[PDB]
Amino acid sequence: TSNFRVQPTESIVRTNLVKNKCVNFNFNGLTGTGVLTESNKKFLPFQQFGRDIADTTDAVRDPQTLEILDITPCSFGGVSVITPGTNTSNQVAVLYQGVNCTEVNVFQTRAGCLIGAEHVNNSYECDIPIGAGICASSQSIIAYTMSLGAENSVAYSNNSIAIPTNFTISVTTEILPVSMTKTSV
């Protein structure tokens, strides 16, 4: 449906310094967006910033106190909606992709934060794929780890055989596209 985005809360003009939250920082004219938690990177006295492989600002040096504050930008993702048929129900479930549930029947999975679903601990065949192993499906939306299939143990002795005694002729339908519509512009 859309893209989930966390917003900052205040502007830091360097006023004071705050930590562990999404904030806007203004250090001698340069802006940005991230979490100004402090770190312990090596500080050679001439150096100011740290950078990764792809040349993006990670750390920063405060112009008053000599400390290094690494930056982790605000979380984001795409909101995704699980829906049954409108002839059946009108209930939904709003997944947040790759977002921990402390950032939004809240249930947390490695695919993301899933809200409008139950957590049945049984195993059925898969209906609507959520991701990373679980998939969704008396009007209660449930979420459960999918069952791959039934389980069987073949009676393998060293003198045991099975032979069929009756058959079943089957007819299978296979559909293959062959062409589009011939078009010119």
Binding site: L176, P177, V178
Partner: protein
């Protein structure tokens, strides 16, 4: 749904081109008539260049996507041609190519922008349990089965084919001698 999806992607791309005709791509208007009816040529040249760049990029994108999709449909078409030749005109042995099961026939029917096969497949469905033996020793000489398996019902030993239960009596016609018993693991001692 496959053929419907092909129709839907083609119609969606064709509609998308018309929506980009309705787009603007940075100019002050989306129509050459209102561009030319008011503006002088030294500025109309720049604006029409903007529209040309936009629509030419759009049409190039459309043709590239058609080329990739046509490659996809060409792969499907060659697969359909091969499958016609092997399944329709003959009896294949490549398993799970002409349908799940031991395939034995096929029939085509036409369909919008495609083909439909009706794969007729033998399947077995009702099973039992029996006791086997890799060979059978009678006079110290091992006998082996030509085609099929060796089975028993607790008291007598029978030979049948591998794929439909129909047992016969052990005679010289269905078993051949291949030497000595002592090398083969699993030998039993019934009469041949």
């Amino acid at each position: 749904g496959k053929l419907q999806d092909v129709v839907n992607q083609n119609a969606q791309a064709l509609n998308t081109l018309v929506k980009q005709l309705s787009s603007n791509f940075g100019a002050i208007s989306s129509v050459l008539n209102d561009i030319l009816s008011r503006l002088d040529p030294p500025e109309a040249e720049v604006q029409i260049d903007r529209l040309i760049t936009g629509r030419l990029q759009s049409l190039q994108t459309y043709v590239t996507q058609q080329l990739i999709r046509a490659a996809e449909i060409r792969a499907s078409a060659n697969l359909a041609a091969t499958k016609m030749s092997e399944c329709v005109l003959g009896q294949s042995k490549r398993v799970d190519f002409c349908g799940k099961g031991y395939h034995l026939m096929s029939f085509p029917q036409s369909a919008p922008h495609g083909v439909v096969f009706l794969h007729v497949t033998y399947v077995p469905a009702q099973e039992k349990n029996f006791t086997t033996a890799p060979a059978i020793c009678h006079d110290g000489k091992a006998h082996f089965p030509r085609e099929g398996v060796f089975v028993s019902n607790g008291t007598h030993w029978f030979v049948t084919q591998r794929n439909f239960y129909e047992p016969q009596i052990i005679t010289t016609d269905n078993t051949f001698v291949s030497g000595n018993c002592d090398v083969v693991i699993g030998i039993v001692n019934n009469t041949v």
